[PDB]
Amino acid sequence: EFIPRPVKSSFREGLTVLEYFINTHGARKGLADTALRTADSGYLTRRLV
Amino acid sequence: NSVPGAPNRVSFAKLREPLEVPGLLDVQTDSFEWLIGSPRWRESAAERGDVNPVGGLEEVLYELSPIEDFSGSMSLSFSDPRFDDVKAPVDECKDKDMTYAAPLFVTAEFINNNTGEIKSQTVFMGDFPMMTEKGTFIINGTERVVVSQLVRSPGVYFDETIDKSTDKTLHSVKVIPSRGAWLEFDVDKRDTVGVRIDRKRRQPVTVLLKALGWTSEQIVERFGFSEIMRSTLEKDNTVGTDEALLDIYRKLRPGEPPTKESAQTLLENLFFKEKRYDLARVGRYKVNKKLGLHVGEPITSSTLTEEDVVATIEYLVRLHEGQTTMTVPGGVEVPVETDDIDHFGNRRLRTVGELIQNQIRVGMSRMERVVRERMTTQDVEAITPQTLINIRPVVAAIKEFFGTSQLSQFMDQNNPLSGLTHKRRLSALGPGGLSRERAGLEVRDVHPSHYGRMCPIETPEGPNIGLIGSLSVYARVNPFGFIETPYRKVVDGVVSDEIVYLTADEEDRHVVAQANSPIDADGRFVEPRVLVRRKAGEVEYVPSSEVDYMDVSPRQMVSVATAMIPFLEHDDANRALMGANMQRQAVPLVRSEAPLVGTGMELRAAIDAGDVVVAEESGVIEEVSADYITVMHDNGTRRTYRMRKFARSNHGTCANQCPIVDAGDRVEAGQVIADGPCTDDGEMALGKNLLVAIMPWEGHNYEDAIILSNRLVEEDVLTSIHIEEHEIDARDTKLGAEEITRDIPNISDEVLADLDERGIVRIGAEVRDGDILVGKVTPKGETELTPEERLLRAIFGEKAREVRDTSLKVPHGESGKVIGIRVFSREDEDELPAGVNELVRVYVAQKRKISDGDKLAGRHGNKGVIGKILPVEDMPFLADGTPVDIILNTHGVPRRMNIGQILETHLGWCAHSGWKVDAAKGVPDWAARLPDELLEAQPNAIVSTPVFDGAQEAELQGLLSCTLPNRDGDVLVDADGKAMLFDGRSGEPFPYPVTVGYMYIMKLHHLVDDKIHARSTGPYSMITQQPLGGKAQFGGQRFGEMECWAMQAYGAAYTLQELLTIKSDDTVGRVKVYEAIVKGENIPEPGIPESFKVLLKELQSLCLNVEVLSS
Amino acid sequence: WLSAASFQETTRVLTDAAINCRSDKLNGLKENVIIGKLIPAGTGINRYRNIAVQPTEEARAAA
Amino acid sequence: QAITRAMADQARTIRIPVHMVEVINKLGRIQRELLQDLGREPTPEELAKEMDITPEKVLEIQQYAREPISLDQTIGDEGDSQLGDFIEDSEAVVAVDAVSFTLLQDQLQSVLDTLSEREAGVVRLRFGLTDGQPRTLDEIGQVYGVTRERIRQIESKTMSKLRHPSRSQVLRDYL
Amino acid sequence: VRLTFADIELDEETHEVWKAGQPVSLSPTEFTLLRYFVINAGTVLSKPKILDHVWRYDFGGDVNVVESYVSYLRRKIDTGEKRLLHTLRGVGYVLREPR
Amino acid sequence: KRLKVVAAFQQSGNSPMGMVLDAVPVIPPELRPMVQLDGGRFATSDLNDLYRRVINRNNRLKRLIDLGAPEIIVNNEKRMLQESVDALFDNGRRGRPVTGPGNRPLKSLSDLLKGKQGRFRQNLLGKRVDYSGRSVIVVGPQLKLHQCGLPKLMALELFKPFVMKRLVDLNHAQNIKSAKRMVERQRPQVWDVLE
Amino acid sequence: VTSIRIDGVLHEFTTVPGVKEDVTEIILNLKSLVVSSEEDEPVTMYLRKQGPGEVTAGDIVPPAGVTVHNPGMHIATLNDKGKLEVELVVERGRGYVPA
Amino acid sequence: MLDVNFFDELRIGLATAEDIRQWSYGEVKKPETINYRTLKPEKDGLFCEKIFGPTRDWECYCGKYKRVRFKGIICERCGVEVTRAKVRRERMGHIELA
Ligand SMILES: [Zn+2]
């Protein structure tokens, strides 16, 4: 889902503690999903070939 | 600075902190002290919860005691577990491959009541391994570290589910105790309530309640509001307490004839008897807190209770009804809600002490069973506790844990930061934890309760992403294994100086403010609505007169390693994670210059890593050398610190220590006396400051490649000492005893020049690949001699040559000098493994220089290999003529969002050049809030930038504006941090100014010398004739299924056939192809692979008639 | 059945093949790879593997 | 008796006779008893004194008591590969010493051809090069019609002249 | 260049053996057998090993000739029934020093 | 679903008696090697234990039936023999698997045929290959499209027989043994012919 | 200077007894020596010091025909038990040549 | 069936007792693998030379034949067949179930 309070600042001006916390939330979710997706795509292409 | 010898490091921090960082080794040290029962932990428990101070050993001894026989007239008990002086010092234990341990004694008392007898003895329970002052264990000369693990705390957990068939809300509860049988309740799709226990999908709650001795009238009078399960009761179709017990027995115990008493005794033994079911103390506390049973009582009776069971059922039915508050009869009022399984209020931390206690418990259970059998068998009135207790199970269990367990790992010591991060690390694998294949995205995610407990940035990037993390820099471990963090309190709107440690349970019942809030320097908040964290982890704006807690300081949310990353808030999360992970892979160089721009965490990390000698007592320094340092204390006594030199670490890196003190200077307690591998002046220094331009150059830095000057190779700026050890042993064999000797049969004389009379290479002799280190020969006698070999022997007149020389040779692919030799022999009282009469280890060191293919990195995840080392003349240079030291591509910065590295570059150039803010008419507006003693910095100054209370963009812009010239009047770097560079090849000035500065660059442990591999023909496996794998053997590349698919897609069949038949499996094919390739003829036809024949035989062995038909 | 067993459900495929006494013609690419003979694709086709080259008559005369 | 005999017969992968199993268990039991009594692991000499047997036999029993390990057990920290993937093949042909051996065969054939036919044949049937069997003095005498003493003399002369510098230097590298 | 162990001192060049320092004569085959034993002191040599090296390569006889030679050498140099020429059943003979 | 197997049995020449076994085969010992590794310790192939268990159960059963035993004892022995055979073929298929030291399940015959680490995928489709190498990658912007830069030590090791034969032909070494010696020592006269 | 030699050491990774300085860091300090030679052949110069003091580049005796130019640069620091004895061999050349 | 890479078909099917006995080169009836002292395979054991071929090339159980000339002749004293030890990777055994 989307947190109602977004990050008002940018990386140029620097982020705050909670802003970095939520950014880390999103980044960790993405880093896990790509790792799973690699193996999933490998299985899919193995079946296809 | 709180450190007497701390070098001055001006800081940009705007807000002060109330409390200093605690001991970074507390998580291990305090736990081990609790396990031992030391007086320090006794005092700690007395000052904090003196109600029941008991160590792990005392607790397990009291739980096991008193062992009772069937008769009951005689019994055994254990008490007073005491320790003894250690066997040997840590250095001696590491050198002689011993185990740093200490004897353990237990006062055993055997009592006999039939006639009256007391037998008191001091039984030697074994040699308990000890923990050094740095939180490490020494096992067989190796430094092992036990990483604390994260496990679900035993207790009661509620969950909610949507069936998705009728969209009906269902609720379930699980009571999971450690070392016990599951308890489960749920509501089904219909109104029926299920108590599926030990995987038996029947017996609704009513039959269990009846078996518990509860009448139907009692059930309806107590649990009356629950109309759904009241209807379930009306549909129980099983009336009678005895009938309920009969049903429960006949289901959970099939095959046995139920009896009147067996049902009751089995129902009791299943849950209410601690011999087969017991929640831990933490589990009992969690259940009591959840159900509001006891609030002013100590933890006892760890087994489950019928009152607890009925309270759980009431909680489940009330939660399903939609209630939000329950007062259990005889208990306090508690909220009613589901429990998150990944919340840190339930994910407890099993530490080193807890793991050791569990292993001791297993060993002592085995010992108790053995001793009970022995004391039943042996005669009475002639028995002794010494003759009763046998310590073999206990010592076997402790050895089986401390060795060969994934929760006790090698202490990687690439650098002190790597060691300190290996300690205070929270894993999620091993026994009692989820597996990597078992793991899921939900557990791998980040929880809002992680704030201040587990850092969400520092974690491995491999397949275990999210399963391993690091403790927060301010975190602490509560007595029950729950991670708690300190936070200050606010009253009336003013922040006090009081600090209270809060577990994640209470943090949901409060409103925690923000660390860098606009404090008014009096206590009030200048801005009414501030950003805070609410109960459910939400962040929102709340008026200042409503918050009740505040963060102690910034960086509380971050670990120790990541806290050393400057401008962290300017870096993206993934790149910051990459940089934090790479910080622990930096090798220690020969100088390790301190960084120009850093944070305040480096000094504390270096101090707490234990790699720098510190003055235990204040005093003057009497004499100083390269090996030892003598300190003349105040009270007459003097101390001598022995300083290790060129000691090989776990990963083959030097651990040199150097004095930093003089011959007359005074030193106070805690002051750094000698710096270690990656320390400068007492603060961590994992890299070097390099002059960097961030423009592309001729494509040699294309796609994350890095360009460097040749002066880095020349001046030894980036060089590392790598020490590798080689071992060989002489052991008795059926044909006699192999001996180490310089007399090797049928060898040349030149190759024996470096061997002394002992047969071992002389110290300091340069060695290269293919040489001989230890001259060892074994008794082979003779084998089948072919006629050609007989002819050769009889024509060259060789003697018997009765022995075969399996001498030690250096591995293929490295060289270097010889440091020292350690010789072990059983003829000199030295203890060796049985059958071995001589052991020799040779240390080889290489002064490895920087080269192309090596991996360099920054502190912001900007890694890269070295594309090309350029000559110093052919590099860009400023107008002053100083060439740039390192060139990085500019296309990698904006895409990856790591502008913090450019911020660090600008600040590093400012620090190197020095600055002075012209306060002619007041300080400028951007420098108004800038702290004093920072308005004027000498050249080559060192500044500290806290991760979140760092230097602002306006302040750094002003500092770049005031950038006082270098030697003559010249400002090489303009206002916006750029400069004009002259091309070193063509000579024309570069058309546009490029950004230049000073950046901290570290050399990672990915040297190409350790990765280059090639193979033409080597060893093969036994079952199948495929070549081996890995650089340990000669290797051989893995041509996998994807490679086969690509080969087939290309349409080239001959190359695939060759890669499969004559290069891997066909033995005659290999021999013939080698013969053809040496004699010059063309490659012969491939044959049938051996793996196919192996598969055919395997299929035939499975009673399958498989054959091949030619027509 | 060789290709099916190497792909997936090895025990089930082997049991079914053994029960049905099935035979593999070894004409498939995967089984050719497994047994080590030339795959029936690309340079493994007969029309490409069984070509015969020889110097031209004028070239041989001039040689 | 039946249980103990069956345990001794079928407990270990490598069969050990009961006469040795009994002494192995006795040595282990009294070794643990001595360790318990003394507080330190008993030394091999103490164990030998307790056995009333020599320390060499004590050590032989100790090394006999070892059991084999599974070749298929996981060796890595995680489950990636088995121990059987880390063991070489001693009996496998190295594919280079075979080429060295056949070239040595050709060179030895040429060197033998450089000498006289009589001496070359004497050496060949004496060392068994044409066939596997190295013939005896009586055999070479009866197949060549020469006295055994004369055959011994000519064999010694052939060996001495085959030790000659150029032949020795040529054959030296093949070792 | 001499080959010695404890009380046995064999000089090949002069072709003599010393057992506590008096002349003693041996048959040749026994002499080269003693030379093979002394050159490999402390290491057991197998019976086919000894037959192939110290006897001729194509020895078509039976093994016990080596045991007769060993008995000859023992009664020649090892007077007592506790010997320096040890025998290991099924593995062969060796010349160590008793411990 | 019953006919799909009944008719398959009917049409072919095989017999449904193949389900039961009166005798089982034994894989060749080289496919189940027992090797004395360095240090005197031994290593077994984890199939010898199952075969030994089956042999022990069969011998005990035949001894019991020859001597004369109660029918319940004979039936228990027969059940043990059947369980041992099932463990040898498909360990863990029925009930808990038979486990060795360290509480790890013994691998059976079919256990080395299924899965990614099984023989079919890990040893037949893919293979370890000689005359091959690996190392890190750097940028080669001065090279052409059809060219790559190979380390000289890596290329020497890869092309070892080629360079050995060529240097023997050039009379730099008298024979293959000397050629191998000079290649291993990396003599200066090796790179010139290596190019 | 291309090669050095200390009497009490055997390789660069040891420590001379009595001197606070290490061998490797002594080498690195010696890296900053500037000289001027007139003889192309290798030339040896000596440095001998004993007693408590800071040995610099002014205590090294250059043979005639060569010149040292930075004698005030620091080399090592000794103690009462300290004793330094090193020999430096120097040659001409151009550019950077590794060890 | 001649291993010449000329395979028209590859067949599988259920194996009967007669087929298993045809495959088998002998019957193993002893759960012994290696002698603990001589380190040699035991007779009629899981590694029996008589059943599975000689351990060493051109060698009988004790050494009555040790030459390549004795091609394919079984030893009268032991019963092993003098051939290449690689046949130990091809010969198959069987056991008779009670
Ligand atoms: Zn025989």
mmCIF file of N, CA, C and O in Angstrom, chain B residues 124 386 389 391-392 395 436 746 787-788 791-792 794-796 798 801 1017 1019-1022 1025 1028 1071 1074 1078-1079, chain D residues 32 36 39 78 85 87-89 93-95 99 101 103-105 108 127-129 134 159 162-163 168 171-172 175:
data_model
loop_
_atom_site.group_PDB
_atom_site.id
_atom_site.type_symbol
_atom_site.label_atom_id
_atom_site.label_comp_id
_atom_site.label_asym_id
_atom_site.label_seq_id
_atom_site.Cartn_x
_atom_site.Cartn_y
_atom_site.Cartn_z
ATOM 1 N N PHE B 124 34.128 -32.995 38.757
ATOM 2 C CA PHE B 124 34.686 -32.240 37.638
ATOM 3 C C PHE B 124 33.790 -32.460 36.426
ATOM 4 O O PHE B 124 33.823 -33.519 35.798
ATOM 5 N N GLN B 386 30.702 -39.621 42.558
ATOM 6 C CA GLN B 386 31.770 -39.720 41.573
ATOM 7 C C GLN B 386 31.544 -40.934 40.682
ATOM 8 O O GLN B 386 31.598 -40.837 39.451
ATOM 9 N N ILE B 389 27.983 -39.995 38.343
ATOM 10 C CA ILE B 389 27.930 -39.034 37.245
ATOM 11 C C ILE B 389 29.008 -39.351 36.217
ATOM 12 O O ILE B 389 30.169 -39.598 36.565
ATOM 13 N N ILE B 391 30.509 -37.639 32.620
ATOM 14 C CA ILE B 391 30.457 -36.350 31.927
ATOM 15 C C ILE B 391 30.579 -36.474 30.420
ATOM 16 O O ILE B 391 30.613 -35.444 29.728
ATOM 17 N N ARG B 392 30.672 -37.695 29.892
ATOM 18 C CA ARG B 392 30.833 -37.868 28.450
ATOM 19 C C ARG B 392 29.701 -37.239 27.647
ATOM 20 O O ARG B 392 29.998 -36.541 26.662
ATOM 21 N N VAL B 395 30.260 -33.282 27.738
ATOM 22 C CA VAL B 395 31.392 -32.788 26.960
ATOM 23 C C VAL B 395 31.160 -33.025 25.472
ATOM 24 O O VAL B 395 31.515 -32.186 24.635
ATOM 25 N N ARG B 436 16.454 -21.119 4.541
ATOM 26 C CA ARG B 436 16.540 -20.224 3.391
ATOM 27 C C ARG B 436 15.478 -20.558 2.351
ATOM 28 O O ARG B 436 14.787 -19.669 1.842
ATOM 29 N N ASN B 746 65.872 -39.267 -6.195
ATOM 30 C CA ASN B 746 65.757 -38.913 -7.612
ATOM 31 C C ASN B 746 65.263 -37.480 -7.804
ATOM 32 O O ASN B 746 64.275 -37.224 -8.496
ATOM 33 N N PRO B 787 58.236 -53.275 -17.384
ATOM 34 C CA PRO B 787 59.559 -53.605 -17.936
ATOM 35 C C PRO B 787 60.366 -52.386 -18.339
ATOM 36 O O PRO B 787 61.590 -52.380 -18.165
ATOM 37 N N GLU B 788 59.717 -51.347 -18.869
ATOM 38 C CA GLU B 788 60.440 -50.132 -19.230
ATOM 39 C C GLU B 788 61.025 -49.449 -17.999
ATOM 40 O O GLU B 788 62.169 -48.978 -18.028
ATOM 41 N N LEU B 791 63.996 -51.429 -16.886
ATOM 42 C CA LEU B 791 65.129 -51.131 -17.755
ATOM 43 C C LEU B 791 65.760 -49.794 -17.401
ATOM 44 O O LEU B 791 66.985 -49.679 -17.341
ATOM 45 N N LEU B 792 64.936 -48.769 -17.167
ATOM 46 C CA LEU B 792 65.467 -47.454 -16.814
ATOM 47 C C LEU B 792 66.241 -47.508 -15.503
ATOM 48 O O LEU B 792 67.357 -46.979 -15.400
ATOM 49 N N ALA B 794 67.697 -50.102 -14.135
ATOM 50 C CA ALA B 794 68.893 -50.918 -14.265
ATOM 51 C C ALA B 794 69.912 -50.350 -15.244
ATOM 52 O O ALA B 794 71.057 -50.812 -15.250
ATOM 53 N N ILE B 795 69.539 -49.374 -16.067
ATOM 54 C CA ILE B 795 70.484 -48.744 -16.980
ATOM 55 C C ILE B 795 71.077 -47.476 -16.378
ATOM 56 O O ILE B 795 72.239 -47.154 -16.627
ATOM 57 N N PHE B 796 70.306 -46.745 -15.574
ATOM 58 C CA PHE B 796 70.844 -45.586 -14.877
ATOM 59 C C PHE B 796 71.478 -45.956 -13.545
ATOM 60 O O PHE B 796 72.035 -45.084 -12.872
ATOM 61 N N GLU B 798 70.161 -46.742 -10.654
ATOM 62 C CA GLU B 798 69.552 -46.202 -9.448
ATOM 63 C C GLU B 798 69.610 -47.232 -8.332
ATOM 64 O O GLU B 798 69.619 -48.441 -8.577
ATOM 65 N N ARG B 801 65.722 -46.830 -4.189
ATOM 66 C CA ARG B 801 64.727 -45.751 -4.128
ATOM 67 C C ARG B 801 63.433 -46.256 -3.490
ATOM 68 O O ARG B 801 62.343 -46.194 -4.060
ATOM 69 N N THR B 1017 44.178 -30.124 -18.017
ATOM 70 C CA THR B 1017 43.905 -31.515 -17.662
ATOM 71 C C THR B 1017 44.314 -31.717 -16.213
ATOM 72 O O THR B 1017 45.467 -31.458 -15.855
ATOM 73 N N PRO B 1019 42.566 -33.617 -12.200
ATOM 74 C CA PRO B 1019 41.944 -34.797 -11.594
ATOM 75 C C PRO B 1019 40.502 -34.977 -12.053
ATOM 76 O O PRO B 1019 39.898 -34.104 -12.677
ATOM 77 N N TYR B 1020 39.955 -36.147 -11.726
ATOM 78 C CA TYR B 1020 38.587 -36.500 -12.072
ATOM 79 C C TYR B 1020 37.925 -37.167 -10.876
ATOM 80 O O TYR B 1020 38.594 -37.692 -9.983
ATOM 81 N N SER B 1021 36.594 -37.139 -10.865
ATOM 82 C CA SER B 1021 35.834 -37.758 -9.791
ATOM 83 C C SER B 1021 35.797 -39.276 -9.966
ATOM 84 O O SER B 1021 36.172 -39.822 -11.007
ATOM 85 N N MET B 1022 35.331 -39.963 -8.923
ATOM 86 C CA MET B 1022 35.359 -41.424 -8.891
ATOM 87 C C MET B 1022 34.117 -42.042 -9.531
ATOM 88 O O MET B 1022 34.226 -42.818 -10.484
ATOM 89 N N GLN B 1025 33.365 -39.770 -14.298
ATOM 90 C CA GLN B 1025 34.688 -39.315 -14.699
ATOM 91 C C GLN B 1025 34.736 -37.826 -15.024
ATOM 92 O O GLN B 1025 35.659 -37.386 -15.719
ATOM 93 N N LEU B 1028 36.911 -32.317 -11.579
ATOM 94 C CA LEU B 1028 36.535 -31.737 -10.299
ATOM 95 C C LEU B 1028 36.180 -30.260 -10.472
ATOM 96 O O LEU B 1028 36.197 -29.707 -11.574
ATOM 97 N N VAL B 1071 42.291 -39.525 -23.491
ATOM 98 C CA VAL B 1071 43.656 -39.990 -23.725
ATOM 99 C C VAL B 1071 44.024 -39.833 -25.196
ATOM 100 O O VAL B 1071 45.099 -39.323 -25.539
ATOM 101 N N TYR B 1074 44.433 -36.124 -26.231
ATOM 102 C CA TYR B 1074 45.723 -35.598 -25.794
ATOM 103 C C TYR B 1074 46.851 -36.125 -26.672
ATOM 104 O O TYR B 1074 47.741 -35.366 -27.077
ATOM 105 N N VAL B 1078 49.213 -33.754 -29.091
ATOM 106 C CA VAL B 1078 50.664 -33.640 -28.950
ATOM 107 C C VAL B 1078 51.388 -34.143 -30.195
ATOM 108 O O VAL B 1078 52.413 -33.585 -30.589
ATOM 109 N N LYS B 1079 50.878 -35.189 -30.851
ATOM 110 C CA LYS B 1079 51.553 -35.726 -32.025
ATOM 111 C C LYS B 1079 51.268 -34.934 -33.294
ATOM 112 O O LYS B 1079 51.985 -35.107 -34.286
ATOM 113 N N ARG D 32 37.711 -43.662 29.547
ATOM 114 C CA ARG D 32 36.777 -42.681 30.090
ATOM 115 C C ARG D 32 36.779 -42.707 31.615
ATOM 116 O O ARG D 32 36.685 -41.656 32.259
ATOM 117 N N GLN D 36 37.746 -39.527 33.941
ATOM 118 C CA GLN D 36 36.894 -39.083 35.039
ATOM 119 C C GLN D 36 37.662 -39.034 36.353
ATOM 120 O O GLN D 36 37.522 -38.082 37.130
ATOM 121 N N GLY D 39 40.714 -36.173 35.973
ATOM 122 C CA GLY D 39 40.397 -34.821 35.572
ATOM 123 C C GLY D 39 41.034 -34.385 34.272
ATOM 124 O O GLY D 39 40.727 -33.288 33.787
ATOM 125 N N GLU D 78 26.184 -24.469 3.607
ATOM 126 C CA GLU D 78 24.818 -24.767 3.216
ATOM 127 C C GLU D 78 24.803 -26.078 2.435
ATOM 128 O O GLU D 78 25.825 -26.750 2.283
ATOM 129 N N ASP D 85 32.189 -34.951 -4.280
ATOM 130 C CA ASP D 85 32.620 -34.018 -5.310
ATOM 131 C C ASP D 85 33.999 -33.436 -5.035
ATOM 132 O O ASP D 85 34.511 -32.678 -5.866
ATOM 133 N N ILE D 87 36.753 -35.489 -3.928
ATOM 134 C CA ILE D 87 37.730 -36.570 -3.878
ATOM 135 C C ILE D 87 38.146 -36.917 -5.301
ATOM 136 O O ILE D 87 37.294 -37.101 -6.178
ATOM 137 N N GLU D 88 39.454 -37.009 -5.525
ATOM 138 C CA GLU D 88 39.996 -37.307 -6.841
ATOM 139 C C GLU D 88 39.867 -38.798 -7.145
ATOM 140 O O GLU D 88 39.318 -39.578 -6.363
ATOM 141 N N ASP D 89 40.384 -39.198 -8.303
ATOM 142 C CA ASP D 89 40.399 -40.592 -8.734
ATOM 143 C C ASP D 89 41.853 -41.028 -8.867
ATOM 144 O O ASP D 89 42.535 -40.640 -9.822
ATOM 145 N N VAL D 93 43.525 -42.541 -15.415
ATOM 146 C CA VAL D 93 44.668 -42.245 -16.270
ATOM 147 C C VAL D 93 44.821 -40.735 -16.403
ATOM 148 O O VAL D 93 43.847 -40.013 -16.658
ATOM 149 N N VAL D 94 46.050 -40.247 -16.214
ATOM 150 C CA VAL D 94 46.303 -38.807 -16.202
ATOM 151 C C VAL D 94 46.380 -38.211 -17.600
ATOM 152 O O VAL D 94 46.361 -36.982 -17.741
ATOM 153 N N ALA D 95 46.461 -39.047 -18.636
ATOM 154 C CA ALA D 95 46.431 -38.684 -20.052
ATOM 155 C C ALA D 95 47.687 -37.964 -20.528
ATOM 156 O O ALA D 95 47.769 -37.620 -21.712
ATOM 157 N N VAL D 99 51.270 -40.541 -22.727
ATOM 158 C CA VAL D 99 52.048 -40.055 -23.863
ATOM 159 C C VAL D 99 53.537 -40.145 -23.560
ATOM 160 O O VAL D 99 54.342 -40.552 -24.412
ATOM 161 N N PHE D 101 54.931 -42.285 -21.612
ATOM 162 C CA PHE D 101 55.286 -43.697 -21.622
ATOM 163 C C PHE D 101 55.427 -44.234 -23.039
ATOM 164 O O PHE D 101 56.354 -44.998 -23.325
ATOM 165 N N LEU D 103 56.140 -42.496 -25.770
ATOM 166 C CA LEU D 103 57.354 -41.922 -26.345
ATOM 167 C C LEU D 103 58.603 -42.568 -25.756
ATOM 168 O O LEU D 103 59.591 -42.779 -26.468
ATOM 169 N N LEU D 104 58.578 -42.890 -24.460
ATOM 170 C CA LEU D 104 59.685 -43.622 -23.859
ATOM 171 C C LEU D 104 59.841 -44.993 -24.499
ATOM 172 O O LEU D 104 60.961 -45.461 -24.712
ATOM 173 N N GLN D 105 58.722 -45.655 -24.797
ATOM 174 C CA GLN D 105 58.775 -46.949 -25.467
ATOM 175 C C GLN D 105 59.441 -46.828 -26.831
ATOM 176 O O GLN D 105 60.318 -47.627 -27.182
ATOM 177 N N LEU D 108 63.212 -46.076 -26.352
ATOM 178 C CA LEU D 108 63.928 -47.266 -25.906
ATOM 179 C C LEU D 108 64.076 -48.270 -27.039
ATOM 180 O O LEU D 108 65.123 -48.915 -27.170
ATOM 181 N N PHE D 127 64.668 -58.686 -20.041
ATOM 182 C CA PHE D 127 63.815 -57.766 -19.303
ATOM 183 C C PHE D 127 62.344 -57.871 -19.678
ATOM 184 O O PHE D 127 61.525 -57.131 -19.124
ATOM 185 N N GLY D 128 61.985 -58.770 -20.590
ATOM 186 C CA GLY D 128 60.596 -58.953 -20.954
ATOM 187 C C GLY D 128 59.978 -57.732 -21.601
ATOM 188 O O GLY D 128 59.069 -57.117 -21.036
ATOM 189 N N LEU D 129 60.467 -57.364 -22.783
ATOM 190 C CA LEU D 129 59.918 -56.238 -23.529
ATOM 191 C C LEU D 129 58.991 -56.671 -24.655
ATOM 192 O O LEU D 129 57.943 -56.052 -24.858
ATOM 193 N N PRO D 134 59.876 -61.769 -18.210
ATOM 194 C CA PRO D 134 61.330 -61.647 -18.387
ATOM 195 C C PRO D 134 61.984 -63.018 -18.294
ATOM 196 O O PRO D 134 61.949 -63.671 -17.247
ATOM 197 N N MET D 159 75.125 -54.043 -20.920
ATOM 198 C CA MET D 159 74.660 -53.060 -19.950
ATOM 199 C C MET D 159 75.688 -51.950 -19.764
ATOM 200 O O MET D 159 75.337 -50.761 -19.730
ATOM 201 N N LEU D 162 75.649 -49.778 -22.752
ATOM 202 C CA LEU D 162 74.403 -49.027 -22.794
ATOM 203 C C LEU D 162 74.357 -47.923 -21.751
ATOM 204 O O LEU D 162 73.535 -47.007 -21.871
ATOM 205 N N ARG D 163 75.218 -47.987 -20.737
ATOM 206 C CA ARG D 163 75.388 -46.872 -19.805
ATOM 207 C C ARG D 163 76.154 -45.702 -20.418
ATOM 208 O O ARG D 163 76.563 -44.796 -19.679
ATOM 209 N N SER D 168 72.651 -42.344 -21.980
ATOM 210 C CA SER D 168 72.206 -41.953 -20.646
ATOM 211 C C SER D 168 71.604 -40.553 -20.655
ATOM 212 O O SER D 168 70.562 -40.314 -20.034
ATOM 213 N N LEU D 171 68.114 -40.676 -22.291
ATOM 214 C CA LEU D 171 67.084 -41.289 -21.460
ATOM 215 C C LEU D 171 66.891 -40.591 -20.117
ATOM 216 O O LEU D 171 65.938 -40.923 -19.404
ATOM 217 N N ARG D 172 67.764 -39.648 -19.752
ATOM 218 C CA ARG D 172 67.680 -39.026 -18.432
ATOM 219 C C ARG D 172 66.375 -38.263 -18.242
ATOM 220 O O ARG D 172 65.739 -38.363 -17.187
ATOM 221 N N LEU D 175 62.355 -39.299 -16.634
ATOM 222 C CA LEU D 175 62.341 -39.770 -15.254
ATOM 223 C C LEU D 175 61.989 -38.637 -14.294
ATOM 224 O O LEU D 175 62.042 -38.803 -13.076
#
